[model samples]
Target chain A: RMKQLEDKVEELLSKTYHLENEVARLKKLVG
Target chain B: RMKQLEDKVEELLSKTYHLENEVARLKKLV
Candidate 1:
């Protein structure tokens, strides 16, 4: 089903967003 | 073609991979 692709995209987006936040957090720690 | 969805997934995968590396780099800096 096309729905599977949607879920995959959602999962990747979730991971990407989490990583973005993590990067920001680490940068704050570095400063 | 279903290839478009495949491409979308590839693009997302590339983004996720790049972000993962950025997170690692930032952690090393921290």
Candidate 2:
């Protein structure tokens, strides 16, 4: 199940980075 | 090990939600 966990974490990280980048992008517009 | 994954996923979920909320907040400002 470690592999499963790794895969899940990989996708979670992708989601986190997506939203994380969005926040930065929005910050520029807000500023 | 399964419990570890559950805990790790829990933290990840928390982080995702935090960033998710941040995006919404910034959207309003933007």
Candidate 3:
């Protein structure tokens, strides 16, 4: 159902945040 | 360093697999 897809999208976004967060953390250490 | 990003990217990808797998599972129900 549409609700199911929405759930996945939210989860995907949550994962994306982790990626972005890690990148920021790395930048702190690198430069 | 590069290795740190690599690790995060790898972890990010693993979460992606859960996403793909869940979608596939849902498709069968529909």
Candidate 4:
């Protein structure tokens, strides 16, 4: 369970970077 | 204004699909 939890955390962190990039791109396009 | 409105709608739709996939993954994990 611990290992599985760590994997999810890592994946979530990576996904946040992708999310940030998308938001930044939109902010640029929107303006 | 119309172009801006459509752009937001499109972005929101794409974001919701992305959010749904993450929810599915979490449901599988926990």
Candidate 5:
């Protein structure tokens, strides 16, 4: 049997990058 | 068949802590 195209890292990395930017924006706003 | 698992959560508190400090420094400088 063959495995599905499921274990991708791109989504995880993108989510992390989004979080970083979000935190950065919030920090600027709060200060 | 077998089992595989994964999960996660970002440490926003700590990241926010350091980011706040960095912003504070930059604001002072700018």
Candidate 6:
């Protein structure tokens, strides 16, 4: 259970990182 | 299982929302 939960968190973090990058790019463009 | 509950996902979502707001503000400021 712990391992599974950890994996999910890691995946979510990765997705969030990508999202942050994308948003930052758009922000720069719009700014 | 129960331990696999959602936590970081929500946290990330919240942080992402704040970042979006910040980015919007900075974009406007700069």
TM-score of each: 0.69, 0.68, 0.47, 0.51, 0.40, 0.54
lDDT of 1 by residue, B1-30 (tens): 578878879898987888788778767766
lDDT rank, highest first? 2, 1, 6, 3, 4, 5
Which candidate, 1 or 6, has the higher lDDT?
Answer: 1
Which 10-residue window in model 2 chain B sums to the lowest lDDT? B21-30
| Candidate 4 C-alpha lDDT tens digits along B1-30 | 655655655576566668757655654654
**Positional deviation of A30 in candidate 5, in angstroms?**
0.4
Q: Interface Cα RMSD for all candidates?
A: 1.2, 1.3, 12.7, 13.0, 7.6, 3.8
- After best superposition, candidate 6 residue B29: deviation in angstroms? 22
- The candidate with the higher DockQ, 3 or 6, is 6
C-alpha lDDT (0 to 100) for residue B29 of candidate 2: 61
Give each model's whole-structure lDDT. Answer: 0.80, 0.80, 0.61, 0.61, 0.51, 0.69
Q: How many residue pairs clash in each candidate?
A: 0, 0, 0, 0, 0, 0
Error of 3 at A13 (Å): 1.4
Q: Is candidate 4 or candidate 5 better by DockQ?
A: 5
Looking at chain B only, the TM-scores across the models are 0.82, 0.83, 0.70, 0.93, 0.59, 0.77
- Flag regions of model 2 displaced more than 4 Å: B1-5
Error of 6 at B7 (Å): 6.0
In angstroms, the error of model 2 at A18 is 0.4
Give the per-residue lDDT digits (tens) of candidate 6, residues A1-31.
Answer: 6777678678767867876787778767776
All candidates: TM-score of chain A: 0.74, 0.78, 0.71, 0.87, 0.65, 0.87
